[PDB]
Design a protein around this ligand. Structure first.
Ligand SMILES: COc1ccc(CCN2CCC(Nc3nc4ccccc4n3Cc3ccc(F)cc3)CC2)cc1
Length: 274
């Protein structure tokens, strides 16, 4: 019945725990924000956007990915697989765009906290978050319309994105979506950290929070992306174990961010203590 060998259970039994902990922590963060007035700041809007993206990548893709791992097939509804892809790619890129927006906001604030003050109303933070989410949801077009744009799954042993066999698009979208946000974020973070070390202490807790979030990303997703852009050329080169572990390393990052917040802010630990 497309089962898995009894030696593949002792890891799914903990993947389910990771799935439940991701949605038990992100939901806790979200309820913390909507239960206390002190947490309706500007950067907490970006934190909420990140927590929502992690809730989606912990509640929609985690159980579907676990079921796909346990049952090595996806003859389980073509539109359902399309929805899983459209809620995996969009969530994973929305997390990295929300982090990018937060990093730009903090870099503008640390630029000079006398010139970026009239562009920090919460309405504009919400507008930027909605714009980032729109750019993320733009990922629906290629997945659902590659058979319409390029005159080209038809593979029922496993459902996959329609451009998996398109090396040029894969490498180009990987380069853009990861590297350019990653490079820009690293540049902004270095520019922040220089000034923060320069002046002086809430700055050396907020800078550490942003640095830990960025470290989480650039250190838990890059094992996936280096493999993704080395596999785009090597075709006799298909180690499934490393790929399957790197994807779940990124998912562990999604789980870790809700643990990152308590250990970098006192307000979050004060509202998590009860
Ligand atoms: C059981 O076997 C399987 C086999 C396959 C799968 C799919 C796993 N899925 C996991 C998440 C992956 N996201 C992803 N790849 C990308 C390639 C180019 C551009 C963006 C890409 N993005 C989104 C992203 C964006 C920024 C970022 F910082 C991180 C990611 C896509 C793959 C699941 C189970």
């Amino acid at each position: 019945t497309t089962m898995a060998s009894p030696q593949l259970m002792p890891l799914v039994v903990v993947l389910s725990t990771i799935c439940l902990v991701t949605v038990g922590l992100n939901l806790l963060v979200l309820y913390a924000v909507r239960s206390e007035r002190k947490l309706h700041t500007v950067g907490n809007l970006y934190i909420v956007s990140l927590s929502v993206a992690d809730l989606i990548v912990g509640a929609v893709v985690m159980p579907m990915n676990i079921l796909y791992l346990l049952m090595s097939k996806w003859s389980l509804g073509r539109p359902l697989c399309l929805f899983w892809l459209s809620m995996d790619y969009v969530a994973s890129t929305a997390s990295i765009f929300s982090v990018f927006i937060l990093c730009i906001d903090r870099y503008r604030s640390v630029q000079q906290p006398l010139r970026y003050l009239k562009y920090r109303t919460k309405t504009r933070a919400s507008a930027t978050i909605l714009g980032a989410w729109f750019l993320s949801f733009l990922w629906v077009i290629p997945i659902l319309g590659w058979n319409h744009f390029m005159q080209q799954v038809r593979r029922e042993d496993k459902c996959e994105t329609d451009f998996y066999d398109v090396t040029w698009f894969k490498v180009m979208t990987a380069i853009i979506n990861f590297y350019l946000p990653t490079l820009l974020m690293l540049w902004f973070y270095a520019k922040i950290y220089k000034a923060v070390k320069r002046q002086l202490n809430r700055e050396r807790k907020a800078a550490k929070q942003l640095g830990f979030i960025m470290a989480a990303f650039i250190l838990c997703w890059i094992p996936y992306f280096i493999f993704f852009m080395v596999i785009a050329f090597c075709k006799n080169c298909c180690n499934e174990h490393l790929h399957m572990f790197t994807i779940w390393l990124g998912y562990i990052n999604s789980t870790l961010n809700p643990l990152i917040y308590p250990l970098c802010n006192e307000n979050f630990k004060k509202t998590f203590k009860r």
